[PDB]
């Protein structure tokens, strides 16, 4: 007989940066 | 029955011909020399009645029928699901030239791109082979019912499996009236105009009309027992024969109903009236006819030969009632309305933000006509080009998604975007251009007569002294805004409440030893309210807005 | 013997449910009328609704309502917890649910109840696994198809209805969506009467004051308060009595009398479960601890206590009250101390938030956190929210030429729309304290967001004397000392100095 | 243990929770300690996986629901409560959250007495100075 | 500007592949400044998208021989912000500088399928409007 | 080793740790070596993946709990101690943080003598000057 399974691998995020000018 | 369904006369005729001609006289198809197809798909929004029409076709057709559904095919025993589908097809052939209907194919169509299990892939391949294995002389047609067309295995779209599809869309208002009538014959009708109810009903589709009808019926039933005081003992026949759902029930049901598509994005019922928006008379009129013509006289637009404008931007300094105009429009538009705030759509997960923009515009197109109010559009429309690396191009992606979804509004489905920003200087020059967002309404500082109108509109509910003169106030307050006047009135009200509480505690002490000593506001209250009254207008900001308006 | 007696009182009748009169009655009609007077629905022509969705914050008695209806109705009842259906075996969870529905139909007309549907309706579009999507498809098929429902009604309970598949939120599957929100003051009064009629209370019991002083408790919160009070009383009396593990005399069992001191102490040591995450221990500051600012103290006290104590007068004139206020002046003048005092005496809830605390390195969580905080504030209203140093979070949008990633501009836009937008604006008061009012955006200081611009000037000699008395109110001092000289000698100093 | 329940099989974790609770109620009037809840309550909103929210729903049902508890008391331990679902922090599920913070000099003295009772100390040693000079020790 | 990371160059690569496959063709690049924006002024970027797009455009336009006879047409409002590395000889050297009669012809072409009033002349609108454009 | 226990599959890395510790405590009094914990100690607050929190919690439970250890000792190895969860740097889990820095010139001489005992060099060359020339060369 067969069976099922759950799976959760990863995702993708985005970061935010601060800059300094001159 | 076949006539039971309605609102989609063209599609019902198409499907009826498609199902009857290869089933009533297949011999003529052989004589002409065309092999009729075996697979036929219908796709549309939820509640359109696809299952209803399929059931009616199963009923009105004398030929034998069989129903299959996606989630009941797979089974614990290995390889037994494929055998189940195979034996289903063998019985479909062996019994008679029947018609087989598979419900919710999307459960058995994971696009084979995100599909990872081996049993699911096997079942998909088995069904693909069986469909391809349906010879010309099979003389049995399969009918597929998909709720969403994008999550479909492209292999199923190939010729020989599913060539004829029908996008059963939301019915016309006249079709909506026809469906309402279909619901309205069985029930006991009061003496009195479903045409008006359909002309005012805009976003509801199919089952939503049934929901409205049921809700009105329930309200009618609710008034009856409470007045009759009917108890658990028994029902009174005099009540039973005296039953007719009136117009007021339908008013109540419409006031307590919303389209199933918008059920998630319902909005708080805040009430505003056209007399609450003091001043801005020309603005109020121009907005109302601009909203009323495309929604009531589509033929007039055709006669003119120029489609109406779609976007608009309200701009001005804060406290000029722009959000108040948005509320008033949301209250009195006779159409759907979705309020959207800028930062709400953004999401950290990469792509999700644009997905949210896409789905919100999907609902906007679904519940057409609609009025999407984007408050503080600047948060989205930040001018760029030197940002370089900061947010992560995600803001640029959002702006690109909004731009591509704002120019892609065809003549159909007539969706109006209302913008509201305080500082238009930061908006992207692209969006402000015509073709995507053309109209620009400017909300100047109120005139003195407009100021008086605003003042009178804010004290509509407040009991007032008989000998109250507001002309002096207007002559004094020259550069103020509606919010400033609201602050003045609230200060006066607070002073009055303080006096009333003082008098009430004095009277309570007297009792320990009229009800309202100040039933209305007094002139002294206004005198003290204006002692602490100031204007939030920044003269420099005024100059900047004037310069921008001149540049316009 | 006791089993029969226990069963009778075990069931919680409809009278047990309180504070939700309108919604409870509506659902009672929906469940009873087709099972008490079906004939009217055959005579009128139309069928009744056969689907209901309960939604609201937790501990709102929705599960209590399910138990109450199950106890009241004599019809068959089927109970299904949400995650309970699935199993390791392939294709058996849907088989199990189908078997459940078939059994429900086979036996009698029945009411199915599916608890925590949010785990079972993931919208079938954002998930990546197919088992959930096929379970959703199976539920949709059972709710819609040949013989979709046959004289059986389905009740569902949820906490996040917006994370549900739109097809499940449609007429024909779930016709009515009931919103059981925070109970009103009267509702809390009935809840208190329900929870206080069982145990024995002393004659000093007066529930009206307790219902008035509670501001955000819903259901179980109130029950918890009651329990805590009782336990405190038990601790007051389990101390005077010895350990006595063998048995306790009736005289201690009798004359318990949960005093008002117990109730007040338990209310002072409790808070609504909503604010349980954000609240912190607060220092104590008397009004006499705040020297000077007499007119400002009275103005703020009346402007906060009037909507909460005198709402009838507001409806008499039918005008909304002022909400915001912004103090500004030189630092250390006593602004933050005044805010602490307001937190200590005022009855309304206090939400203390630091200025740059809420900023995030990720994308969009600043505005999401602002929305979450503001939702919490408007949920458990009346509330007092203190924004310390608005110039840290509020600036003129776009002023800084150097790119910040747009975070600050988007945050300020979120603030603007929350202080003035499509808001209910019932009972939320924004208090600001900044010593540099030039850096704040001109829109925030507008009336309708921040209508009161209060300047806190330097104290005078009499105010310095008042402050000296306030801070010398505890420490012992010289009888021969007169502070008049100190006042005559201090001119430019502040309270902190 | 906290992560002891999570498994590769779909739904078996909740089955394990059901078995645990049913055995606990079937055996005797028991006390159930669930350790390190910070890994089994990710607020149901910041997380993206499906199994964890399902486990959270199972736990919420176990704590409150039809005949939720009878002669069973649940105690939990965690190092960060702010990263917990509010639905678990309500009366009926988790009535009261007790805090265990930094002891003072006297508290440090009892802890020192506890920890210095079994070894052979010198006669010239005292615990008062040690309890005073020790400031930030968590015991 | 493909959302997929790095694909912002593959889009231009396969656009020029579709151009060179169906030779001859005309690639009308509208609003060149938005694409080129020059280089150097803003050293940083969101993954150097700008500089990578300009380098892809230069390396997929300078590789055009006498075969495949492609032709790039540009148009802009601001000619100041175009890259001199793309205005160089050997890549794109032509400079076409772009009235009343054109305004009258535009007004007569816009009013083709329109029931106009017979007593109406558009020469007044042509003479009154001088520095206008077809969109307005 | 550090990254070899991680499993993207749900609830399997924890099982791997369970089997590892069970075998470790089954055989005999044992010494365990967990290489590169910095891949399994992101402090549970910065990273967004729930799997890291779950593995950290499982490690904490294994290193601390009811009848945690019996006659075994655990040692860790890392290059970035500052990027570690403070709950892992506690007495009873990892009490002794030993440092290993660059050896002295004498250390270089000793290492060379270790390296040049099995090979064969010439007489003329000495290792003292060679050790002195090797200033920062480590291991
Ligand atoms: Mg259907
Ligand atoms: Mg419950
Ligand atoms: Mg301060």
Give the 3-state DSSP-derived string for B56-85, with helices as H, strands as E and coil as C.
HHHHHCCCCEEEEEHHHCCCCCCCHHHHHH
Is residue B152 exposed (0-12), middle (13-18) or buried (19+ Cβ within 10 Å)?
buried
For the annotated binding site of D, the residues are 79, 115
| Ligand found nearest the CA of B47 | 1
Resolution limit in angstroms?
4.3
d(CA B220, CA B187): 12
Give the Cβ contact number of residue F112 at 10 Å. 16
Question: What is the Å distance from ligand 1's center to C145 Cα?
Answer: 5
Please choose, from the candidates B222, B420, B190, the residue with its C-alpha nearest in 3D space to the C-alpha of residue B323.
B420
Distance from CA of C61 to the nearest CA of D (A): 10
Helical (H) or strand (E) element with B496: helix B482-512
Give the position of tokens 């270790």.
F114
Give the Cβ contact number of residue B174 at 10 Å. 12
Is residue C183 exposed (0-12), middle (13-18) or buried (19+ Cβ within 10 Å)?
buried
Q: Which two three-digit tokens encode residue C224?
A: 């918890």
Q: Which residues have C-beta within 8 Å of that of residue D18, sequence separation ≥ 6?
A: C84, D58
Q: Which two three-digit tokens encode residue E42?
A: 């803003």
What value, to the nearest 5°, has the Cα angle with vertex F110 and ends F108 and F113?
110
d(CA E58, CA E52): 10
What dihedral do alpha carbons C156, C162, C164, C166 form, nearest 10°? 110
d(CA C293, CA C338): 9
Distance from CA of F18 to the nearest CA of D (A): 9
Identify the three-state secondary structure at position F18. Answer: helix
Helical (H) or strand (E) element with B43: strand B39-43
Alpha helices in B201-280 (DSSP H): 207-228, 237-241, 247-255
C416 contacts C444 by C-beta, under 8 angstroms: yes
d(CA B486, CA D68): 52
Q: What is the DSSP letter of E4?
A: S
d(CA B167, CA B48): 10
DSSP for F47-79 reads ---HHHHHHHHHHHHHHSSTT--SS-EEEEE-S
Question: What is the Å distance from ligand 2's center to C131 Cα?
Answer: 26
C413 contacts C397 by C-beta, under 8 angstroms: yes
d(CA D13, CA B401): 41
DSSP for B260-300 reads SGGGTT--------TTTS-S-HHHHHHHHHHHHHHHH-HHH
Q: Which residues have C-beta within 8 Å of that of residue C181, sequence separation ≥ 6?
A: C56, C57, C60
What pairs with residue C350 in β-bridges?
C384
d(CA E82, CA B354): 30
CA distances from B209 to B45, B260, B437, C42, C50 (A): 15, 11, 34, 20, 17
Strand arrangement of the beta sheet that strand B338-341 belongs to: B338-341, B370-375, B415-421, B311-315, B439-442
Q: Which residues of A touch B (CB under 8 A)?
A: 1-2, 4, 7, 11-19
Is residue D27 exposed (0-12), middle (13-18) or buried (19+ Cβ within 10 Å)?
exposed
Q: Which residues have C-beta within 8 Å of that of residue B250, sequence separation ≥ 6?
A: B197, B212, B216
Q: Which residues of E70-93 are buried (b: 16+ CB within 10 A; e: fewer)?
A: bebebeeeeeeebbeebeeeeebe
CA atoms within 13 A on the CB side of F111: 14
Give the position of tokens 């015991």.
D139
Q: What is the DSSP letter of B399?
A: H
PDB experimental method: cryo-EM
Give the orientation angle of helix C220-238 with respect to helix C185-196, to 10 degrees.
40
Question: Which residue in F12, F14, F60 is closest to D36 by CB distance?
Answer: F60
Instruction: Tell me: is residue B51 an annotated ligand-binding position.
Output: yes
Q: Which two three-digit tokens encode residue C365?
A: 């969580």
Give the orientation angle of helix B482-512 with respect to helix C294-309, to 10 degrees.
80
Question: Which residue in A1, A6, A21 is closest to C131 by CB distance?
Answer: A6
Q: Which two three-digit tokens encode residue B432?
A: 């402000």
Helical (H) or strand (E) element with E25: strand E25-30
E residues 104..133 contacting B (CB < 8 A): 113-115
Q: Which two three-digit tokens encode residue B493?
A: 């009200």
Q: Which residues have C-beta within 8 Å of that of residue C432, sequence separation ≥ 6?
A: C324, C325, C326, C327, C386, C387, C390, C450
Long-range contacts of B186-192 (CB under 8 A, 24+ apart): B186/C45, B186/C46, B187/B213, B187/B217, B187/B245, B187/C44, B187/C45, B187/C46, B188/B243, B188/B244, B188/B245, B188/C44, B188/C45, B189/B244, B189/B245, B190/B244, B190/B245, B190/B246, B190/B247, B191/B244, B192/B246, B192/B247
Q: Which chain A residue is nearest to residue D13, measuring alpha carbons?
A: A6
F residues 2..31 contacting A (CB < 8 A): 8-10
Q: Residue C163: which region, alpha, beta or left (left: phi > 0; alpha: psi -120 to 50)?
A: alpha
d(CA F7, CA F15): 10
User: Are D38 and F58 a contacting pair at CB < 8 A?
Assistant: no
Indicate the length of chain A as a whole number. 22
User: Are C132 and D95 a contacting pair at CB < 8 A?
Assistant: no
Alpha helices in B297-447 (DSSP H): 298-304, 322-331, 352-366, 394-406, 429-432
CA atoms within 13 A on the CB side of B518: 21
Instruction: Identify all chain D residues contacting A3, using CB atoms and an 8 Å cutoff.
Output: 9
Please choose, from the candidates B191, B248, B259, the residue with its C-alpha nearest in 3D space to the C-alpha of residue B220.
B248
What pairs with residue C110 in β-bridges?
C76
Q: Which two three-digit tokens encode residue B476?
A: 């004094």
Indicate the length of chain E as a whole number. 136
CA distances from C97 to B277, C115, C127, C171, D56 (A): 55, 14, 21, 22, 21
Q: What is the DSSP letter of E68?
A: T
3-state secondary structure B497-529: HHHHHHHHHHHHHHHHCCCCCCCCECHHHHHHH
d(CA D55, CA D34): 14
Cis peptide before B369 (omega within 30 of 0): yes
Give the Cβ contact number of residue D14 at 10 Å. 26
Instruction: Tell me: is residue B150 an annotated ligand-binding position.
Output: no
- Based on its alpha-carbon atoms, the radius of gyration of chain B, rounded to whole angstroms, reads 31
F residues 40..59 contacting A (CB < 8 A): 48-49
Identify the three-state secondary structure at position D73. Answer: strand
C373 contacts C387 by C-beta, under 8 angstroms: no
Q: Which residues have C-beta within 8 Å of that of residue A14, sequence separation ≥ 6?
A: B348, B349, B350, B391, B392, B394, C362, C363
Taking the Cβ of residue F9 and every Cβ of chain D, the question of whether any pair is shorter than 8 Å is answered with yes
Instruction: Identify all chain B residues contacting C95, using CB atoms and an 8 Å cutoff.
Output: 75-76
Q: Which two three-digit tokens encode residue E5?
A: 């990371």
What pairs with residue C155 in β-bridges?
C52, C113
Instruction: Identify all chain C residues contacting D14, using CB atoms and an 8 Å cutoff.
Output: 83-84, 86
B437 contacts B372 by C-beta, under 8 angstroms: no
Is residue C245 exposed (0-12), middle (13-18) or buried (19+ Cβ within 10 Å)?
exposed
Question: What is the Å distance from ligand 2's center to C62 Cα?
Answer: 6
Q: Which two three-digit tokens encode residue B197?
A: 């109810």
Instruction: Identify all chain C residues contacting A11, using CB atoms and an 8 Å cutoff.
Output: none
Q: Which two three-digit tokens encode residue E33?
A: 């400044």
Give the orientation angle of helix C131-143 with respect to helix C93-107, to 10 degrees.
20
Distance from CA of D54 to the nearest CA of C (A): 6
Identify the three-state secondary structure at position E81. Answer: coil
What value, to the nearest 5°, has the Cα angle with vertex B226 and ends B224 and B231?
100
Phi then psi for residue B31, to 5 deg, are -65, -45
Identify the three-state secondary structure at position B126. Answer: helix
Please choose, from the candidates C125, C130, C206, C213, the residue with its C-alpha nearest in 3D space to the C-alpha of residue C165.
C125
Q: Residue E48: which region, alpha, beta or left (left: phi > 0; alpha: psi -120 to 50)?
A: left
CA distances from B269 to B257, B334, C272, C464 (A): 12, 14, 27, 51
What pairs with residue E117 in β-bridges?
none
User: Are C39 and B240 a contacting pair at CB < 8 A?
Assistant: yes
User: Are D10 and A8 a contacting pair at CB < 8 A?
Assistant: no
d(CA D50, CA D42): 12
Question: Which residue in D9, D14, D66 is closest to C83 by CB distance?
Answer: D14
Q: Which two three-digit tokens encode residue B356?
A: 């949210």
DSSP for C299-316 reads HHHHHHHHHHH-HHHHHH
Q: What is the DSSP letter of E125?
A: H
B213 contacts C46 by C-beta, under 8 angstroms: yes
d(CA F87, CA F43): 9
Give the Cβ contact number of residue C108 at 10 Å. 10
Is residue C68 exposed (0-12), middle (13-18) or buried (19+ Cβ within 10 Å)?
buried
B131 contacts B142 by C-beta, under 8 angstroms: yes
Q: Which residues of D127-138 are buried (b: 16+ CB within 10 A; e: fewer)?
A: beeebeeeeeee
Distance from CA of B380 to the nearest CA of C (A): 8
What value, to the nearest 5°, has the Cα angle with vertex C31 and ends C26 and C34?
115
Helical (H) or strand (E) element with B458: helix B448-458
Q: Chains F, E in contact: 3+ Cβ pairs under 8 A?
A: no
User: Are E46 and B392 a contacting pair at CB < 8 A?
Assistant: yes
d(CA B36, CA B163): 11
CA atoms within 13 A on the CB side of B306: 9
Q: What is the DSSP letter of D133?
A: H
F127 contacts F109 by C-beta, under 8 angstroms: yes
- Based on its alpha-carbon atoms, the radius of gyration of chain D, rounded to whole angstroms, reads 21
Q: Which residues have C-beta within 8 Å of that of residue D33, sequence separation ≥ 6?
A: D74, D75, D76, D77
Give the Cβ contact number of residue B527 at 10 Å. 11
């Amino acid at each position: 007989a067969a069976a099922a399974a759950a799976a959760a691998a990863a995702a993708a995020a985005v970061a935010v940066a601060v800059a300094v000018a001159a | 029955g076949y006539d039971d369904i309605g609102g989609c006369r063209k599609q019902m005729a198409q499907i009826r011909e498609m199902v009857e001609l290869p089933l009533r006289h297949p011999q003529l198809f052989k004589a002409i020399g065309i092999k009729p197809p075996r697979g036929v798909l219908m796709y549309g929004p939820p509640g359109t009645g696809k299952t209803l029409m399929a059931r009616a076709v199963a009923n009105e057709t004398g030929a034998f029928f069989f129903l299959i559904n996606g989630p009941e095919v797979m089974s614990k025993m290995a390889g037994e699901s494929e055998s189940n589908l195979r034996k289903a097809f063998e019985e479909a052939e062996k019994n008679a030239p029947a018609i087989i209907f598979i419900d919710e194919i999307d459960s058995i169509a994971p696009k084979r791109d995100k599909t990872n299990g081996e049993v699911e892939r096997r079942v998909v391949s088995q069904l693909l082979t069986l469909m391809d294995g349906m010879k010309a002389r099979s003389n049995v047609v399969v009918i597929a019912a998909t709720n969403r067309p994008n999550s479909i295995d492209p292999a199923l779209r190939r010729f020989g499996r599913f060539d004829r599809e029908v996008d059963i869309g939301i019915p016309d208002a006249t079709g909506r009236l026809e469906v309402l009538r279909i619901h309205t014959k069985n029930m006991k009708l009061a003496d009195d105009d479903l045409e008006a109810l359909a002309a005012e009903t805009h976003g509801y589709v199919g089952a939503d009309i049934a929901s409205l009808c049921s809700e009105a019926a329930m309200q009618q039933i609710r008034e009856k027992m409470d007045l009759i005081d009917l108890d658990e003992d028994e029902i009174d026949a005099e009540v039973l024969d005296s039953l007719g759902v009136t117009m007021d029930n339908f008013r109540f049901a419409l006031g307590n109903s919303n389209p199933s598509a918008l059920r998630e994005t319902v909005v708080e019922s805040v009430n505003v009236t056209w007399d609450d928006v003091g001043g801005l008379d020309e603005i109020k009129e121009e907005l109302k006819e601009t909203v009323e013509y495309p929604v009531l006289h589509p033929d007039q637009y055709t006669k003119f030969g120029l489609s109406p404008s779609k976007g608009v931007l309200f701009y001005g300094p804060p406290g000029t009632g722009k959000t108040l105009l948005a509320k008033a429009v949301a209250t009195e538009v006779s159409a759907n309305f979705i309020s959207v705030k800028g930062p709400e759509l953004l999401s950290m997960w990469y792509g999700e933000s644009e997905s949210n923009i896409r789905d919100i515009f999907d609902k906007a197109r679904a519940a057409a006509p609609t009025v999407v109010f984007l408050d503080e559009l600047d948060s989205i429309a930040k001018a760029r080009g030197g940002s370089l690396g900061d947010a992560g191009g995600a803001s640029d992606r959002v702006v690109n998604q909004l731009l591509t979804e704002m120019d892609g509004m065809n003549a159909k489905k007539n969706v109006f975007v209302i913008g509201a920003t305080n500082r238009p200087d930061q908006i992207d020059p692209a969006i402000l251009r015509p073709g995507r967002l053309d109209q620009l309404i400017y909300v100047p500082l109120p005139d003195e007569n407009a100021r008086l109108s605003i003042l009178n509109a804010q004290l509509r509910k407040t009991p007032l002294e008989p000998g109250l003169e507001l002309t002096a106030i207007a002559k004094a307050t020259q550069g103020f805004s509606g919010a400033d006047l609201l602050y003045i009135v609230q200060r006066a009200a607070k002073y009055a409440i303080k006096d009333s509480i003082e008098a009430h505690r004095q009277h309570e002490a007297e009792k320990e030893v009229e009800v309202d000593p100040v039933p209305y506001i007094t002139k002294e209250h206004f005198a003290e309210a204006m002692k602490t009254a100031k204007r939030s207008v920044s003269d420099a900001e005024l100059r900047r807005y004037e310069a921008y308006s001149q540049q316009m | 013997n006791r089993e029969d007696e226990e069963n009778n009182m075990n069931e919680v009748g409809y009278d047990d449910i309180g504070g939700c009169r309108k919604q409870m009655a509506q659902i009672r009609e929906m469940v009873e009328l087709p099972l008490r007077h079906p004939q009217l629905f055959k005579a009128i022509g139309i069928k009744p609704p056969r689907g209901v969705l309960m939604y609201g914050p937790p501990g709102t008695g929705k599960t209590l309502m399910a138990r109450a209806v199950a106890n009241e109705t004599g019809a068959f009842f089927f109970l299904i917890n949400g995650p309970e259906v699935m199993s390791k075996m392939a294709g058996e969870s849907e088989s199990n649910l189908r078997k459940a529905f078939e059994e429900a139909e086979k036996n009698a007309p029945a009411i199915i109840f599916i608890d925590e549907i949010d785990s079972i309706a993931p919208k079938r579009d954002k998930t990546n696994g197919e088992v959930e999507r096929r379970v959703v498809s199976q539920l949709l098929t059972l709710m819609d198809g040949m013989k979709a429902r046959s004289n059986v009604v389905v009740i569902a309970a949820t906490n996040r209805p917006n994370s549900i598949d739109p097809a499940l939120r449609r007429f024909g599957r779930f016709d009515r969506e009931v919103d059981i929100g925070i109970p009103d003051a009267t509702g809390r009064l009935e809840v208190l009467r329900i929870h206080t009629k069982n145990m024995k209370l002393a004659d000093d019991v007066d529930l009206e004051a307790l219902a008035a002083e509670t501001h955000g408790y819903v259901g179980a919160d109130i029950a918890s308060l009651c329990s805590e009070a009782a336990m405190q009383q038990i601790r007051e009396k389990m101390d005077l009595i010895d350990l006595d593990e063998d048995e306790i005399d009736a005289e201690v069992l009798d004359s318990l009398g949960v005093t008002m001191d117990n109730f007040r102490f338990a209310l002072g040591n409790s808070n609504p479960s909503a604010l349980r995450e954000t609240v912190v221990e607060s220092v104590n500051v008397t009004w006499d601890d705040v020297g000077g600012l007499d007119e400002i103290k009275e103005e703020l006290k009346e402007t906060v206590e009037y909507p909460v104590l005198h709402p009838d007068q507001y409806t008499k004139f039918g005008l909304s009250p002022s909400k915001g206020v912004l103090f500004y002046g030189p630092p250390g003048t006593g602004k933050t101390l005044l805010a602490k005092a307001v937190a200590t005496e005022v009855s309304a809830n206090f939400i203390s938030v630091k200025g740059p605390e809420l900023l995030s390195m990720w994308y969009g969580e600043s505005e999401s956190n602002i929305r979450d905080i503001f939702d919490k504030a408007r949920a458990a209203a009346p509330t007092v929210v203190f924004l310390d140093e608005l110039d840290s979070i509020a600036k003129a949008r776009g002023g800084s030429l150097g790119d910040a990633g747009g975070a600050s501009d988007r945050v300020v836009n979120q603030l603007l729309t929350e202080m003035d937008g499509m808001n209910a604006k019932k009972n939320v008061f924004v208090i600001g304290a900044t010593n540099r009012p030039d850096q704040i955006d001109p829109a925030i200081l507008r009336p309708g967001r921040l209508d009161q611009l209060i300047y806190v000037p330097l104290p005078d000699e009499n105010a310095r004397l008042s402050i000296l008395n306030a801070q010398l109110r505890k420490t012992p001092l010289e009888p021969g000392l007169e502070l008049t000289a100190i006042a005559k000698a201090t001119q430019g100093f502040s309270g902190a100095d």
